[PDB]
Amino acid sequence: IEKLKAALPEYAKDIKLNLSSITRSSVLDQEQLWGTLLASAAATRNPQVLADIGAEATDHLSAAARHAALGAAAIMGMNNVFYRGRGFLEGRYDDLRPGLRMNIIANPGIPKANFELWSFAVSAINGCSHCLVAFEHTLRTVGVDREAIFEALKAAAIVSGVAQALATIEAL
Amino acid sequence: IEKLKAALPEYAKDIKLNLSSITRSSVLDQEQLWGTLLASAAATRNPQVLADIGAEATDHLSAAARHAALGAAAIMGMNNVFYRGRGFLEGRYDDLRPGLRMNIIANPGIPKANFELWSFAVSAINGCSHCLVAFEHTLRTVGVDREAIFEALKAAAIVSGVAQALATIEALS
Amino acid sequence: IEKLKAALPEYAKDIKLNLSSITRSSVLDQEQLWGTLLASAAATRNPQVLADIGAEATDHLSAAARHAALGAAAIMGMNNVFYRGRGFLEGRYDDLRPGLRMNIIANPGIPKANFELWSFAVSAINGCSHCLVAFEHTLRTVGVDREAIFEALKAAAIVSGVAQALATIEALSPS
């Protein structure tokens, strides 16, 4: 959304430019791109960026993709804490059954590699290498190019800065 | 947590299902459990999740544990940043006195165990290995089931998922 | 400061006491200290704390300082996600040309060492060792004793506790 780029402060000049460039990515297909932007937007917790990106994503994303993306952010919202936490514990708790329902990862109602690309994205924002690596591994295993994986990473980061540049406006 | 559950979107079904079960756990006593949910809810910093959960954690906790649960999230909001950053600095800042008051760690109106448990839960949410690791160690030495510690970790992550999902609908509805 | 401080919960007295002491410290410049407090306050994403800290920052910092300090939180919000990500992928992508605009870092409207200290502080908040470690290395190089660097870290943690404590009262405040 142009309204999103325009809300950005002058001292967040690079963010705006990175945002504009990422919106024009030739590395990812439309669903992969916008789903990453939308899933990333959700993980920033910034309602502003989610609204605009969500609004902009409506003509690149079917209702299915849109939902699965938000769903990605929600499930990773749980997974990035559990796995990361278990990951800091050296394995000591690996023998226990998590007992966490996470079916959406099994059937996201949309092509798998996309939901993974988006979980990868969110996992990067929340900062859980355990989930980031597993997905980055599955992505390569299913044939997603390194270039595309990197783009999603870039997309996750640009959107984090965007959200952050916005929140910084709370100083009139 | 009746309010939250119904608020959750169907694309967040797994979160819904997970919330409703964690609230019915029986591996952690009423104090250990609700303190975790509360300290967890606070640490997610989602007004909604904290309210609902808080409004219910009340008829499960003495006023001492509540304050303690809430203060655990708050103090660790500081500690988790200081200890992590210091941890990343090649040990070059290990001999310095932090000059950070944290009398609350000298524990509140409750026994150092639940609080250690709640600080554990908050550290997982904040992503601080140093603190997470230390509390897990201290919790065992004290005689706390690894399955309980494990349950606190799940409750923390679940609550995080609730926060994330709820923050989304409230920004799109 | 007094307002924010006064607004904090009874279960956050250490935070209150730490905010107060950190604000009245003398290890860092007035520009170093308030640039850090604001960069930090911004990194917590709490509207109230940014507003209160952003307010008082007007009489301790110059507009440029504040712009650049908020800009540090902004670019670090991107970089901290990127480099940490690369970190988890064990450098497997260190050879793909990030292609991300930054510049501000090379040309802040203020002395670099201060922008670095603030970036260092923000990185501490977001949790990116790569950036933290990197800004740390540069700081020490051009001076700034570990005493100064250590203070900013402290400040970031304290402002981090503030946000958390404030957020729970606002959310738990009657009706």
Question: What HEC string does chain A produce?
Answer: CHHHHHHCCHHHHHHHHHHHHHHCCCCCCHHHHHHHHHHHHHHHCCHHHHHHHHHHHCCCCCHHHHHHHHHHHHHHHHHHHHHHHHHHCCCCCCCCCCCCCCHHHCCCCCCHHHHHHHHHHHHHHHCCHHHHHHHHHHHHHCCCCHHHHHHHHHHHHHHHHHHHHHHCCCCC
Cα(A32)–Cα(A110) distance, rounded to whole angstroms? 11
Write down the experimental method used for this entry. Answer: X-ray
Cα(A124)–Cα(A129) distance, rounded to whole angstroms? 7
Find chain B residues with C-beta within 8 A of C17's C-beta.
101
- Catalytic (active-site) positions of C: 128, 131
Find chain A residues with C-beta within 8 A of C166's C-beta.
none
Cα(B25)–Cα(C11) distance, rounded to whole angstroms? 27
Q: After which residues is chain A broken (C to N over 2.5 A)?
A: none
The verdict on whether A9 is a catalytic residue reads no
Q: Confirm or reject contact between C102 and chain A (CB < 8 A).
A: yes
Q: Left if phi > 0, otherwise alpha if psi is -120 to 50, otherwise beta: which for A24?
A: alpha
Residue whose tokens read 């977001």: C126
The verdict on whether A131 is a catalytic residue reads yes
Active-site residue, from A4, A131, A152, A159: A131
Residue whose tokens read 């992590």: B84
Cα(C151)–Cα(A165) distance, rounded to whole angstroms? 25
Q: Which of C104, C99, C53, C55 is nearest to A8 (CA)?
A: C104
Question: Cβ separation of B82 and C15 shorter than 8 Å?
Answer: no
Cα–Cα separations (whole angstroms), residue A34 to A28, A101, A152, B17: 9, 27, 10, 28
All structural domains of chain C: 1-175 (1.20.1290.10)
- Within 13 Å, how many C-alpha atoms sit on residue A74's CB side? 30
Q: Confirm or reject contact between C43 and chain A (CB < 8 A).
A: yes
Find chain A residues with C-beta within 8 A of B46's C-beta.
45
* Cβ contacts from B onto C, under 8 A: 115
Question: Cβ separation of C14 and B70 shorter than 8 Å?
Answer: no
Structure tokens at B91: 């040990």
Q: Which of B60, B49, B62, B59 is nearest to B1 (CA)?
A: B49
User: Residue A171 in 3-state DSSP?
Assistant: coil
User: Is residue B91 within 8 Å of residue B137, measured between CB atoms?
Assistant: no
Find chain A residues with C-beta within 8 A of B156's C-beta.
81-82, 85
Question: Cβ separation of A101 and B132 shorter than 8 Å?
Answer: no
Question: Cβ separation of B156 and A43 shorter than 8 Å?
Answer: no
Backbone angles phi, psi at B60, to 5 degrees: -150, -15
User: Is residue A68 within 8 Å of residue B11, measured between CB atoms?
Assistant: yes
- Deposited resolution, Å: 2.3
Question: Cβ separation of C50 and A171 shorter than 8 Å?
Answer: yes
Quickly list DSSP for B116-168.
HHHHHHHHHHHT-HHHHHHHHHHHHHHT--HHHHHHHHHHHHHHHHHHHHHHH
User: Is residue B151 within 8 Å of residue A97, measured between CB atoms?
Assistant: no
